[PDB]
């Protein structure tokens, strides 16, 4: 389908009301949580965006599948909790040509809008699978339209990424 | 047809899997492309 540079940017009003949008599509990604959901893990590992992005559900489902397969074969289900935090509400538009007579896009897809320093995904994991958590994060970071950065939060919600990296 | 004398000087080489270039034996990255993936020159038929 059509490139993602056409839908990256945020300079455009929100278009999230299905009781007025005729023909609005339906989601592809329908699973946002994985692994052991009831859990008390130690280390939290989340992607933050470096600038405002607009991420398609194609990309989200790609990320989901890849990361979950990787962690299922390298960690196991009872030892990781994987979550996607953002739902696609933004409807994307395309002009059906007539030319530029009556230009107003008919809907094709969905996207999630994300602002600077916002979380996208999260892997909760013990202390002896951090290597795998960070490999997962690399794989995910590789599939986004703009850049991203990760941290490592403790319970009590504190940043320990440095103290943890320096020792592993 | 064995000649260790010859193997030691034909087959102490690395190959980058990206550009194909040849690097010395103890390299850690390629000297052209910066790739970190280096394999050794096949000394026995693989396949």
């Amino acid at each position: 389908l059509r490139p993602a540079k056409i839908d990256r940017d945020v300079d455009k009003p929100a278009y999230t009301r299905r009781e007025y949008i005729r023909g609005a599509p339906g989601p592809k990604i329908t699973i946002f949580d994985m692994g052991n959901l009831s859990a008390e893990f130690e280390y939290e590992v989340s992607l933050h965006a470096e600038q405002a992005m607009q991420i398609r559900q194609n990309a989200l489902e790609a990320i989901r599948i890849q990361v979950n397969r990787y962690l299922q074969k390298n960690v196991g289900r009872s030892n990781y909790h994987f979550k996607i935090r953002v739902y696609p509400f933004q409807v994307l538009r395309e002009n059906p040509m007539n030319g530029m007579r009556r230009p107003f896009g008919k809907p094709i897809g969905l996207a999630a809008r994300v602002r600077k320093d916002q979380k996208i995904l999260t892997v909760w994991v013990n202390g002896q699978h951090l290597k795998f958590a960070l490999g997962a994060m690399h794989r995910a970071k590789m599939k986004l339209p703009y850049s991203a950065y990760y941290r490592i939060y403790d319970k009590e919600g504190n940043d320990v990424t440095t103290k943890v990296l320096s020792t592993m | 047809a064995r000649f260790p004398e010859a193997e030691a000087r034909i087959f102490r080489k690395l190959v980058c899997m990206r550009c194909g270039a040849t690097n010395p034996w103890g390299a850690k990255k390629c000297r052209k492309c910066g790739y970190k993936g280096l394999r050794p020159k096949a000394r026995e038929p693989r396949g």
């Binding site: - | 047809a1 064995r2 000649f3 260790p4 004398e5 010859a6 193997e7 030691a8 000087r9 034909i10 087959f11 102490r12 000394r43 026995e44 038929p45």
Partner: protein, 183 residues
């Protein structure tokens, strides 16, 4: 600026005579002379008390490297005039025995893989080649001369057209100045 005033000394042995003259080091010993030219801005070379001193008064990384490099070169020259350098090569053949000969300033290898045309490898001034059976010696007094001679003889016999897992014949280096070669 890693440091302030890097300097390194070289102890001079009994029979050797080192002397600098306009960015040109000259070394005399029990056999032969060896001169060379070591130039870099801010690097000095002199003799204080029986030593050779190399000095630089506020180095970056690429000055440190150059200074230790010059050190190695002058050590090489000293040990060369004092003992000399010796190299060994080996000859291997499956079919088509070849014959290696010296004549003047060349090394002629004939019947290599059945060729009707010989192969010529150059000798350099100050180096002596010596064939003894299937083993070859290259002796000399300048490290670089002896290495280049050995390497010319080895490169004389190179293949680019067929599999070298099956076609392995040639002449090979097996000791580069006392150190072996293993794989």
């Amino acid at each position: 600026p890693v440091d302030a005033w890097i300097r390194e000394e070289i102890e001079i042995p009994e029979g050797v005579e080192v002397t600098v003259e306009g960015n040109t080091v000259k070394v005399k010993g029990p056999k032969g002379e060896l001169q060379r030219e070591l130039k870099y801005p801010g690097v000095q070379i002199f003799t204080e008390d029986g030593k050779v001193v190399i000095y630089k008064e506020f180095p970056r990384k690429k000055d440190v490297a150059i200074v230790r490099t010059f050190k190695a070169h002058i050590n090489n020259m000293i040990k060369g005039v004092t003992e000399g350098f010796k190299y060994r090569l080996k000859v291997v053949y499956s079919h088509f025995p070849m014959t290696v000969k010296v004549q003047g300033d060349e090394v002629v290898i004939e019947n290599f893989l059945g060729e009707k045309n010989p192969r010529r490898a150059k000798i350099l001034p100050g180096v002596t080649v010596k064939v003894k059976g299937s083993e070859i010696e290259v002796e000399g007094i300048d490290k670089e001369a002896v290495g280049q001679t050995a390497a010319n003889i080895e490169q004389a016999t190179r293949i680019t057209k067929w599999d070298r897992r099956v076609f392995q014949d040639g002449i090979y280096i097996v000791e580069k100045a006392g150190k072996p070669i293993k794989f």
